[PDB]
A paper describes a structure:
The THDI mediates binding of Myo3 to its cargo protein Espin1 (Ectoplasmic specialization protein 1) and allows Myo3 to transport Espin1 to the tips of actin bundle-based structures such as filopodia and stereocilia. Espin1 is the longest isoform in the family and contains a stretch of ankyrin repeats (AR) in its N-terminus. Here, we discover that both Myo3a and Myo3b contain two highly similar repeat sequences in their THDI region, each capable of independently binding to Espin1-AR with high affinity. The high resolution crystal structures of each of the two binding sequences from Myo3b in complex with Espin1-AR not only reveal the molecular basis governing the specific interaction between Myo3 and Espin1, but also allow us to discern the Myo3-mediated release of the auto-inhibition mechanism of Espin1.
To understand the molecular basis of the Espin1/Myo3 interaction, we solved the crystal structure of the Espin1-AR/Myo3b-ARB1 complex at 1.65 Å resolution. The 10 ANK repeats form a left-handed superhelix with the αA helices forming the inner groove and the αB helices forming the outer surface. Clear additional electron densities lining the inner groove of the ANK repeats allowed us to build the bound Myo3b-ARB1 peptide model with high confidence. The ARB1 spans nearly the entire inner groove, covering ~1230 Å2 of solvent accessible area. The N-terminal of ARB1 adopts an extended structure and binds to the C-terminal of Espin1-AR. The C-terminal of ARB1 forms an α-helix and binds to the N-terminal half of Espin1-AR. The first binding site is formed by the repeats 2–4 of Espin1-AR and binds to the C-terminal α-helix of ARB1. Two absolutely conserved tyrosine residues (Tyr1267ARB1 and Tyr1268ARB1, the double tyrosine (‘YY’) motif; Figure 3B) and Leu1271ARB1 in the next turn insert into the hydrophobic pocket in the N-terminal of Espin1-AR. The two highly conserved Arg residues at the beginning of Myo3b-ARB1 (Arg1251ARB1 and Arg1252ARB1) insert into the negatively charged pocket.
Residue numbers in the entry:
A (entry chain A): 0 to 330
B (entry chain C): 1250 to 1272
The structure:
């Protein structure tokens, strides 16, 4: 266990002399792995220590294509961490193939996009030969990852390289735009809608629109822009009848909730009879309860189980919300 | 219910754990 910690630490630090000493003592080998099955080659590559990576592959003979528990090679580590020098060496001298996949089906191009490394994305596309049309086992393209990260330079590169990806949906139905809205990336959202003809009406498999995702995750700047400039309705419902307001109230996003109410969004029941006040009360979101109650939410509306919002707060132990709601009802 | 709905993810949690522990 001591040789292991010394080897991994030296590989991350670039301490080539320690690796040489361990190699001389016969203490480096392909079974010397951490708890995720990563070798010293992974730890050098994820740390940008190219001289140690080369020593471990060229001299110690640790395989450049070795795989961690999830199938990641040292090239996957390097692409995810942005260490282009290590990635380039592995893909040329090291013998890694640019299309090698981890267990999920992700390539180094997916991972460079996922973690927002546009220098790596650019080199992979225009020198490394990486394929931009490859889906993982969830249906994800590199463009999905770039959009979710909010990496506009990588996204521009990937749209130019594979423009058919713009409106592609993952297996659960998400478009790059859905993901950009979910993650609150306004400039990427604008680019997709304004410059790439991204369709903001393509829904995920559960009926959620990109606007629902922005409200669910509290990204008011994205929600405001979609409603105000992209012709997205804040009244649309998912497969359960939920509106943007339900999602915002359920997760305490008072700014989204306020903006929706300010601009005339209605306080409506979903297919289960719950209003956004039910969602806020059930989850102990006191400030959302107050905003809804002051702006005309029906305090006495019962869901399909016959429960008012105050009842739901009480059954979930949210006594601050139930006490507030029951006193307001008396007025 | 609604609050427990997770965002749409592109990879498995085990995958995210691994790539997050590279830094």
């Amino acid at each position: 266990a001591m040789a292991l910690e010394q080897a991994l630490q030296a590989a991350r630090r670039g301490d080539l002399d320690v690796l040489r000493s361990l190699h001389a003592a016969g203490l480096l080998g392909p079974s010397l792995r951490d708890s995720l099955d990563a070798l010293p080659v992974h730890h050098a590559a994820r740390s940008g220590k190219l001289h140690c990576l080369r020593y471990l592959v060229e001299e110690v003979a640790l395989p450049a294509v070795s795989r961690a528990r999830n199938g990641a090679t040292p090239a996957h580590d390097a692409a995810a961490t942005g260490y282009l020098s290590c990635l380039q060496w592995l893909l040329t001298q090291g013998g890694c193939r640019v299309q090698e996949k981890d267990n999920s089906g992700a390539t180094v191009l997916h991972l460079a996009a996922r973690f927002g490394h546009p220098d790596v994305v650019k080199w992979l596309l225009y020198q490394g030969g990486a394929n931009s049309a490859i889906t993982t086992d969830t249906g994800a393209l590199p463009i999905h990852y770039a959009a979710a990260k909010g990496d506009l330079p990588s996204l521009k590169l990937l749209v130019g390289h594979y423009p058919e990806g713009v409106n592609a949906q993952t297996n659960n139905g998400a478009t790059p735009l859905y993901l950009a809205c979910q993650e609150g990336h306004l400039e990427v959202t604008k680019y997709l809608v304004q410059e790439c003809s991204a369709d903001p009406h393509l829904r995920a498999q559960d009926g959620m629109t990109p606007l629902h995702a922005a409200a669910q995750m509290g990204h008011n700047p994205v929600l405001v822009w979609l409603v105000s400039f992209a012709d997205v309705s804040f009244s649309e419902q998912d497969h359960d009848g939920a509106t943007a307001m339900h999602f915002a109230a359920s997760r305490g996003h008072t700014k989204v909730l306020s903006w929706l109410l300010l601009h005339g969004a209605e306080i409506s029941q979903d297919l289960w009879g719950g209003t956004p006040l039910h969602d806020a009360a059930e989850n102990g979101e006191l400030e959302c309860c107050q905003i809804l109650a002051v702006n005309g939410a029906g305090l006495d509306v019962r869901d399909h189980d016959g429960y008012t919002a105050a009842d739901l707060a009480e059954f979930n132990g949210h006594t601050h919300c139930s006490r507030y709601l029951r006193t307001v009802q008396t007025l | 219910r609604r609050r427990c709905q997770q965002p749409k993810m592109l990879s498995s949690p085990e995958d995210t754990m691994y790539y997050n522990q590279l830094n």
